[PDB]
Amino acid sequence: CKLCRSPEGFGPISFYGDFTQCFIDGVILNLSAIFMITFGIRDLVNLCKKKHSGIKYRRNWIIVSRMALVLLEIAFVSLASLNISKEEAENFTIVSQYASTMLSLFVALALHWIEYDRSVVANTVLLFYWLFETFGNFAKLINILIRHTYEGIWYSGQTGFILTLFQVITCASILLLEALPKKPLMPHTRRKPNPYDSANIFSRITFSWMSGLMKTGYEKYLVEADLYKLPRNFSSEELSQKLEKNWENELKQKSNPSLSWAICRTFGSKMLLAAFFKAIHDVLAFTQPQLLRILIKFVTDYNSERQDPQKLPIVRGFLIAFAMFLVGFTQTSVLHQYFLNVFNTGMYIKSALTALIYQKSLVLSNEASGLSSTGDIVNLMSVDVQKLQDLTQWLNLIWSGPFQIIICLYSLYKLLGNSMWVGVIILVIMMPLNSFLMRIQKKLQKSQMKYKDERTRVISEILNNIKSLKLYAWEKPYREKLEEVRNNKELKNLTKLGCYMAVTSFQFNIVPFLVSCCTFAVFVYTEDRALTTDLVFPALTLFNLLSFPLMIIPMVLNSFIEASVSIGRLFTFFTNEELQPDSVQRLPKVKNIGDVAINIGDDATFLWQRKPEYKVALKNINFQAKKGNLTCIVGKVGSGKTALLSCMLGDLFRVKGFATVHGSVAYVSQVPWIMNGTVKENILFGHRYDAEFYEKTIKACALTIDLAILMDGDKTLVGEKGISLSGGQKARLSLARAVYARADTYLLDDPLAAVDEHVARHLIEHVLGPNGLLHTKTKVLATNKVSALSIADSIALLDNGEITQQGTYDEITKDADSPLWKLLREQGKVKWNIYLEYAKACNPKSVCVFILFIVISMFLSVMGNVWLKHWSEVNSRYGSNPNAARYLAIYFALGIGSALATLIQTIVLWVFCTIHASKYLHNLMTNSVLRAPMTFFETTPIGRILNRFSNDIYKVDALLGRTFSQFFVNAVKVTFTITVICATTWQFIFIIIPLSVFYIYYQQYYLRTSRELRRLDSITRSPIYSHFQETLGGLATVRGYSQQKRFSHINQCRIDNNMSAFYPSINANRWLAYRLELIGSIIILGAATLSVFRLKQGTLTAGMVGLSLSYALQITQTLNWIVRMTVEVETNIVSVERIKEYADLKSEAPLIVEGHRPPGDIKFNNYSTRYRPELDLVLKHINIHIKPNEKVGIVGRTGAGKSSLTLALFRMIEASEGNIVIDNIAINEIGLYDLRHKLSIIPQDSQVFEGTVRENIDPINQYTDEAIWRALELSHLKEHVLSMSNDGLDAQLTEGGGNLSVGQRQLLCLARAMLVPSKILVLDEATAAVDVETDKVVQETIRTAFKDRTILTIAHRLNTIMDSDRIIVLDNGKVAEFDSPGQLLSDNKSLFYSLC
Secondary structure, X not given: OOOOOOOOOOOOEOOOOOEOHHHHHHHHHHHHHHHHHHHHHHHHHHHHHHOXXXXXXXXXXXXXXXXXXXXXXXXHHHHHHHHHOOOOOOOHHHHHHHHXXXXXXXXXXXXXXXXXXXXXXXXXXHHHHHHHHHHHHHHHHHHHHXXXXXXXOOOOHHHHHHHHHHHHHHHHHHHHHHHOXXXXXXXXXXXXXXXXXXXXXXXXXXOXXXXXXXXXXXXXXXXXXXXXXXXXXXXHHHHHHHHHXXXXXXXXXXXXXXXXXXXXXXXXXXXHHHHHHHHHHHHHHHHHHHHHHHHHHHHHHHHHHHOOOOOOOHHHHHXXXXXXXXXXXXXXXXXXXXXXXXXXXXXXXXXXXXXXXXXXXXXXXXHHHHHOOHHHHHHHHHHHHHHHHHHHHHHOHHHHHHHHHHHHHHXXXXXXXXXXXXXXXXXXHHHHHHHHHHHHHHHHHHXXXXXXXXXXXXXXHXXXXXXXXXXXXXXXXXXXXXHHHHHHHHHHHHHHHHHHHHHHHHHHHHHHHHHHHHHHHHHHHHOOOOOOHHHHHHHHHHXXXXXXXXXXXXXXXXXXXHHHHHHHHHHHHXXXXXXXXXXXXXXXXXXXXXXXXXXXXXXXXXXXXXXXXOOOOEEEEEEEXXXXXXXXXXXXXXXXXXXXXXXXXXXXXXXXXXXXXXXXXXXXXXXXXXOOEEHHHHHHOOOOOOHHHHXXXXXXXXXXXXXXXXXXXXXXXXXXXXXXXXXXXXXXXXXHHXXXXXXXXXXXXXXXXXXXXXXXHHHXXXXXXXXXXXXXXXXXXXXXXXXXXXXXXXXXXXXXXXEEEEEEHHHHHHOOOHHHHHHOOEOOOXXXXXXXXXXXXXXXXXXXXXXXXXXXXXXXXXXXHHHHHHHHHHHHHOOOOOOHHHHHHHHHHHHHHHHHHHHHHHHHHHHHHHHHHHHHHHHHHHHHHHOOOHHHHHHOOHHHHHHHHHHHHHHHHHHHHHXXXXXXXXXXXXXXXXXXXXXXXXXXXXXXXXXXXXXXXXXXXXXXXXXXXXXXXXXXXXXXXHHHHHHHHOHHHHHHOOOXXXXXXXXXXXXXXXXXXXXXXXXXXXXXXXXXXXXXXXXXXXXXXXXXXXXXXXXXXXXXXXXXXHHHHHHHHHHHHHHHHHXXXXXXXXXXXXXXXXXXOOOOOOOOOOOOOOOOOEEEEXXXXXXXXXXXXXXXXXXXXXXXXXXXXXEEOOOOOHHHHHXXXXXXXXXXXXXXXXXXXXXXXOOHHHHHOOOEEEOOOOOOOOEEHHHHHOOOOOOOHHHHHHHHHHOOOHHHHHHHOOOHHHOEEOOOOOOOOHHHHHHHHHHHHHHXXXXXXXXXXXXXXXXXXXHHHHHHHHHHHOOOOXXXXXXXXXXXXXXXXXXXXXXXXXOOOOOOHHHHHHHOOOHHHHHO
16 A cells, blocks of 8 residues: 655645645656666667767767766765755655666766767657656755745755755756757768758657748748758658558458558557547646636635635645646647657658559559559549548547547536536537538539639630730620629629628637537526636636537548548559569570570460450460561551560460560550650650760651751650640650660561651661661561561561461562562748738728627627626625526627627628629729730730639639638737736736747748748649659550669659658648647746736736636637638738739720711821830831722731731731821721721631620620621521521520631621621631632622722732732831732732742
8 A cells, every 4th residue: 555754645736736745756756767767778778789980979068068967966866865864764755766866867877978979869768857857856846945935844954955956957957958959970962851850859849840941931932952851761662662561461461451451550650659649638638627727716715715724825826827837838749749640640651652553553454454544543643542641630530539528528517517418419519500501601612613614714715815806896795794794693602602601600609609608507597506717717618628529520530431432442453453474574685686586475375354355365376576687567456466566565464375575675655655854855764865876866767857846956845745746756756765775675566657658768767677776676566567568577467366477578478468469032021012902902991890890709709708707706706696697698698799790790701891802803803904905915825814813813702801801800819818818917918028029930930931831742742643644644665665663763752752842841830830839838827827926916816817717728729820811811812912913904005085986098107016015116117098999908928017917907006106097087096996896807816705696796786686697698607507506696606616617707707897887897817727618708708798898808818819909018017019919910020929
């Protein structure tokens, strides 16, 4: 049985708030000494063993100071034992812990020295030993001093006090000299080693190893070279080898394999450690409310004893406050080690499963690779593995969720009686309601994005057709249609989405209040005891803690089942059947040219797909290929021509006979494959560079011409999906790679079919034939082109998957068979101007009303808690609940006031602030874009333009307002939390100001560096999936060249780069979270200790501390919320920046001017213009005069300004000098709409819009049905619309479809031209995209409809203008040409004459 010799019991906590002497001696210091014995001896043995040379550090002042301070510790502890040898030395705890401490100090003395020369990391055991010695000696000092001040005696005598003080100082000193110093290395472009490897245990706990990266990312934009290389054991190769080594046991040792247990057996140790840390976190998180109760109960007891033996000591209050600090600090320290371990396991599963998926893909049989799509497999890597990575984050909540709920319910039951259950019932009831509301939120988000995509497609129509749209002056009708869709569908849906977010926010405000209100009501009306202030506020904290597990458990279960589905998919993948690696036994080279066989088969059989096929395989092949000779395979499509090459390559399952291929082999597929990259990289294909042979290959292959043609030579980028090249040069490039590889055996699967016959005759001479450079290498070629047969040394012909005839060219010629007949940066400041621009859009009065209702909601919530404080103090003054009805009514009134204020908050946000701003910005951007000059639409791609209408406007609509709302909610909540704490203890100002400085410091560092790191992570994430898809495309050639090792290594490098960017990404979240939770725990310490000082001053009530700490406990969550929301606001507000940079675009000339037109000659006056303001004068000093009915043909060189004439006449480009006159009025001042809508055109780029024929003919609806039908009838596609549908004029054209082919599309444009008053008409050909039928119809329609009005024709086909009575040739932009086409053709050897 337990026994002791001190009046204070052996129990942990004494009458005062500190640990009792016999617990500090008997448990804390004894156990820390024994910890050092055990684990320090273990570490001492390991470090003495492991190394003795090379890495050793310099014996600087650091080590000597450490050793000296340890010696001082031995001095003071021996002196302690001396000072206790007679003062009741019978106390086993004291004497035994002195003995243990002395032995442990000897062990530490040894361990310091043996560490210093060996380890880079300050030893973990030594650091924890000094932490526990410092804490134990400090607790002993506190004990001795408390008993001095309260009982007048020193347990260890006054000498013992000073001696323990010295022990405390020396332990803290050596603790710091162990933790801080870096142990200088004793001196003798890739990324630097990860700091995590060097971080000692305290640095690892506090994530102070991230601080360097956070500072660097705060001061400069991070390029991937700023990241540190990945930690010690994070390599994808190592992790995939581990997982494979276990998965092999699953496959071969178990009766039935399980990939889930492979993953568990591999990575479960980290998850067990994380589970331990999570359990400690749960325990501490629910001790914190118990310390809150203890403090409130202490305050009430103290005040009740000071109002009118062993009166309660204030040091108990101070020690309760400091225990709350320690609880918070240990919560954060263990919580973030839990997050570290689970996220590390997630990254392990990611980088392990990704590399295993790649490696398995390399080994997949073509059977499985056909059985599953490339997209499915790349999604297996991209998404299914993602579910398993995400699963780690939630896995421990499978038990920690219930564990928090179980102990939270126990705590609430013990605190609040059975009335707990009404609050628990409310939470449980609101969980399904939360799911229902979130399902509606998802539905409306889906509908809103559907509307967004619809309106984005309308925008795409407008943008891609902007040329014709501006020319026809159709800007107004299409912009009004866009506005109609916007305002009537997208914003209409957005108002409803806002209303339901308002409902959701009302719920999230009221339910946390409502649980406590209802449980206090049931308590008051069912419990015969006072609803005291030590019940109300701990109950609030406990319900707050209960909310999270209950509301997150559904998400955890969802993730668990979804990851189970993903595991199923991965397991099916890994078990797919493989290549039968011994199908073709590869063998080394053979020297003697010409004679020896290289490829062999002896009546062998090769199946395509095993389980269905037998006696239908490619079979009975007896085959020979021999060094240096070219042997050609012939066969009909599907005959097995490709199959035989696949066999000798090794892609097919054989069951009879044997096959072999000697030496290395190179392979060219019938369909060429080009990995994205430079043409040089595609040719070299991982082989070392030899310039002479590289150029020799480019010359022997006809690739030289293409290599000269392409815009950047061999550095020309084969872009995503290989769009940069066409089929012929693609096949040529594949052959170039094959040649460069200089393999010993060549398997040319029909390269020549994709090549012009002349280029094939070049290739066969330079490469394939004996005259080629490959004459010394074995070549098998599979083509039916007769030239290969003519050059081939020996021939085989196969059909039905069977070899039919084989022999040398001589025998196959003599046989007269069918083959014989054929063959014979620093970071910038925050862009506050954009924030103010968004506020201006939101109607600053409206945004101020929003902030006002934030203030009112938080104010009424705070006054709800203040009324709860008053009510609980009233019940504490009484022995019962005096006016339950009144107090509950007022508390309910204040809580509901807060909830309704939040409802009005969100209604204002959406209906007045966010939706108004979204409409303003969209109208401004679209209006400015459409009135932008062509400079804009030509200098910026339609993709980038459409991106602002698609994504940036969407973010402003649906994310930015929500994020500002959350930011201001949490900022106001923190402001009111600080206000409450300061009102309770005004001296808290001096604590919150320094902590404010630290908070802003960390928040800024995180805001910058986290955006940088997430950017790098997302950038480096995609190359993994794109590379995997590329390899899946090239899977056959990757095996063919037999450089699976190189491709797998490239994949592992992609994975390692992604992790190199990701590991900082989330360790920055750990860094921030640790800082913010440390700040929160220091805030709790400040509030608690200042409240206890106010108690010492005799002016604190229990309710004041209850309220102050109810808020101080929650402040740490709002701090993280504020930081996260600043991050998200900064990421979204660039949307408003990107929108504004278009909304202020330089607009073209004024649309309408006072020179309004009253309603056909054209005259130029020294006119000149540029195709761009920055380019030179492409059109110079024209003065042509054109008579009212005159037909004018325009001709010129390919670089002449003839094309710019139509742009000039429509004033789509302004006059550099001079002007243009129409009907004796200068158009240069007439206004763009008034000008353009009065001229006909058939634009060179015929363009169509979605909608009725009406919308593509008369979108303004300004012309009559009879006239529209007349135009369609004249343009000879009345018939086409009637064939399309019975809707006739309402028949619908679609963008991206093919309702109207180009010719009838030009007739549609001609109809558009016919409707408008054609006093002037302009037309141009689709450049070299016309036919004689389209011509004749065009000219006959023009003669019919426009001959009586001016016509200007720019078409380059001269037949279109031979009949004109006037012609013009643009001599490089100087008009200088004469009247008639016939006169020009006859009177001189004109350019016109030369062209004709």
